[PDB]
Design a protein around this ligand. Structure first.
Ligand code: PXL
Ligand code: CA
Ligand code: CL
Length: 223
């Protein structure tokens, strides 16, 4: 996250770190046994780390649970990042509490200047490299479909939205991938991609979760 703020320990209790010896991606806890992330975050040997603030210090609220199964979306395209969504089942149920809690799936999609909370352990610099140890937060509105398409010609599908600021300075960034965008208590986005970070006219692009809820519920109900 570039130009955001320190969230505060466990203030984003649905935020997960995906760990293959190091943090490589975010995710969102959607019930005691399931995480949603980006398909582009897929790899074997995932440990899900819940209850995390400092990803480099054991602070006392962590639950470390191995993935038993990963399900990349049937229609995921790695070239276009169309359908950039995957589900991860935990080998054991997370113990849900005030600091480890699932985030509601949407019943409807979000719209315009709906303010959203984007979070992750990604890079905090635009033209440098600094990875934070504690979770960073950005409040950002969803941008118009027309603005998003104008910003990224021939790249934005109906399964994508832009959120952030066309003036730049505030954005998601590398290592935020797969993390949440929460708008009025609902998981509406997954951190998907961008052109650099916090560049003018190049806001973050997000997986439109509302398109995927029937697939998420069907998949969870049969696995
Ligand atoms: C610009 C930019 N924005 C977001 C992400 C999230 O992964 C990445 C990397 O995957 C990136 O390069
Ligand atoms: Ca920790
Ligand atoms: Cl910078």
């Amino acid at each position: 996250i570039v130009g955001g703020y320190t969230c505060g320990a466990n203030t984003v209790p649905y935020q997960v770190s995906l760990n293959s010896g190091y943090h490589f991606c975010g995710g969102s806890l959607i019930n005691s046994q399931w995480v949603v992330s980006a398909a582009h975050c897929y790899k074997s040997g995932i440990q899900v780390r819940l209850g995390e603030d400092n990803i480099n210090v054991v602070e006392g609220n962590e639950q470390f649970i191995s993935a038993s199964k990963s399900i990349v979306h049937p229609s995921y395209n790695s070239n276009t990042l169309n359908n950039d969504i995957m589900l991860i089942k935990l080998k054991s149920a997370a113990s849900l509490n005030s600091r480890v809690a699932s985030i509601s799936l949407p019943t409807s999609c979000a719209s315009a200047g709906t303010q959203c909370l984007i979070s992750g352990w990604g890079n905090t610099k635009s033209s440098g490299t600094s990875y934070p140890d504690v979770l960073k937060c950005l409040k950002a509105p969803i941008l118009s479909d027309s603005s998003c398409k104008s910003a990224y010609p021939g790249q934005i599908t109906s399964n994508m939205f832009c959120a952030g600021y066309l003036e730049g300075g505030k954005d998601s960034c590398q290592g935020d991938s797969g993390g949440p965008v929460v708008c009025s208590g609902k998981l509406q986005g997954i951190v998907s991609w961008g052109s650099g970070c916090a560049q003018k006219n190049k806001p973050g692009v997000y997986t439109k979760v509302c398109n995927y809820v029937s697939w998420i519920k069907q998949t969870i109900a049969s696995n």
